[PDB]
Each structure stands twice: as C-alpha cells, then as structure tokens.
Amino acid sequence: MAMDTFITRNFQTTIIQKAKNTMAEFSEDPELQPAMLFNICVHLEVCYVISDMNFLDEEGKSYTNLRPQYEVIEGMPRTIAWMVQRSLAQEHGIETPKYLADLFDYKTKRFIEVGITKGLADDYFWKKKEKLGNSMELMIFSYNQDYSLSNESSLDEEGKGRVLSRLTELQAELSLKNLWQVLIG
Ligand SMILES: O=C1c2c(O)c(=O)ccn2N([C@@H]2c3ccccc3SCc3c2ccc(F)c3F)[C@@H]2COCCN12
Ligand SMILES: [Mn+2]
Ligand SMILES: [Mn+2]
C-alpha cells in the first residue's frame, strides 16, 4: 500500500491533478517525492474546504444571490496565479503582496496564507509571520486539532472544525495504512 495508491483513494481528482502540476512546475517527481505529494494535496484540499463552505451576499453577510467568500490562488501555475493576485489586489484597491498567497478573502479584502504543520500550530504561525509580516493573513492548522489564525473575522467555528476534522481523518487513515511514518521522515 504505497502513497500513490493512498492519494488516489483519499483525494478528489481535481486536487491530485493540481498537486502533481505544481510539483511538475517545480521539477519534482511525485513518484520520488511521495511525502511532498501528500503534503501538497492536503494543503490544496484545505484551501478548497475553506473555499467551498463559505459564502457572501451583496451586503457582505456570511452563509455556509450567493458568491464565494474566498478565491483559491494555490493550485494554478504561478504565471497565472500572479496575474490573479495582482488583478484581485488592484480591483479591491489594496497592495499586491510581494509573496504569492493561497487564498483571497473577498469579505475582508485580504490575501491569506494557509499553513499545515505536524508540529505546534503556534510555532509555524510565527515562522510564516517573520517572513510575511502584515502583508497577508495566516491560517495555520495542525494534525493534532490545533490552529493559529491572524485575525478575528477569518474562518468561523464550524470552518475551523471542518478543516481540523479533515486533517485528523487523513492522519487516521495514513496511520491505519502505515504511511504516517513517511511524513514524519
Ligand atoms: O505556495 C507554496 C507553499 C505553501 O503555500 C505552503 O504553505 C507551504 C509550502 N509551499 N511550497 C510548496 C508546498 C505546498 C504545500 C505543502 C508543501 C509544500 S513543500 C515545498 C514545495 C511546494 C510546491 C512545490 C514544490 F516543489 C515544493 F518543494 C512552495 C514554497 O515556495 C512557493 C510555492 N509554495
Ligand atoms: Mn502557497
Ligand atoms: Mn500555504
């Protein structure tokens, strides 16, 4: 039971193809980098869990007529993603961040960096913060039901819970299949 089989059984094809495309863009081979493949898949999966469950009307009121609260920037070629990020910044009268974000939040008009860690969410928050400063909001999640967020009006309680349930579900299935070892190494 190898990582490639695991990925096929546990991720949607849209997620898998975007992850593999990203790896190919950076000249990395999914067959030779199975930990990396899983990590990219789960990160993109989280971006979509967040984007697929959060909506706005014209007033800007939240629901779980409607438009998505978030646009996913991750999982497209960087040539395209830079156009998207600059376009969204300029459209909303905000600075274009110098780093390529993961999401754009139409509610708050902020870019978001998503981080997944097998360590302490806090620690990873502060690493990304040291680099990104005030340029973007941060959403950091761990496998052990921890998280660290940079602002009040970002993800709600149910959204936090759904991200964390999914990560916990994936870790459980990896451990069941003796593949969690692969990520630790
Ligand atoms: O955008 C990302 C990125 C993130 O957004 C992130 O949260 C963590 C890590 N990232 N990196 C991802 C990535 C994304 C998700 C999970 C693990 C990895 S591991 C390094 C790596 C990435 C992509 C291709 C590749 F060949 C890599 F080696 C690169 C960092 O340089 C900018 C693009 N990018
Ligand atoms: Mn990214
Ligand atoms: Mn990220």
Numbering used by the authors: -1 to 62, 72 to 192
What sentences appear in the manuscript?
The heterotrimeric RNA-dependent RNA polymerase (RdRp) of influenza virus is composed of subunits PA, PB1 and PB2. It is responsible for replication and transcription of the segmented, single-stranded viral RNA genome (vRNA) in the nucleus of infected cells. Transcription of viral mRNAs occurs through a unique “cap-snatching” mechanism. We initially screened metal-chelating compounds by CEN enzymatic assays, followed by a cellular phenotypic screen and then optimized the chemical structure to improve the pharmacokinetics and safety. This culminated in the generation of the compounds BXA and BXM that target the CEN in the PA proteins of influenza A and B viruses.
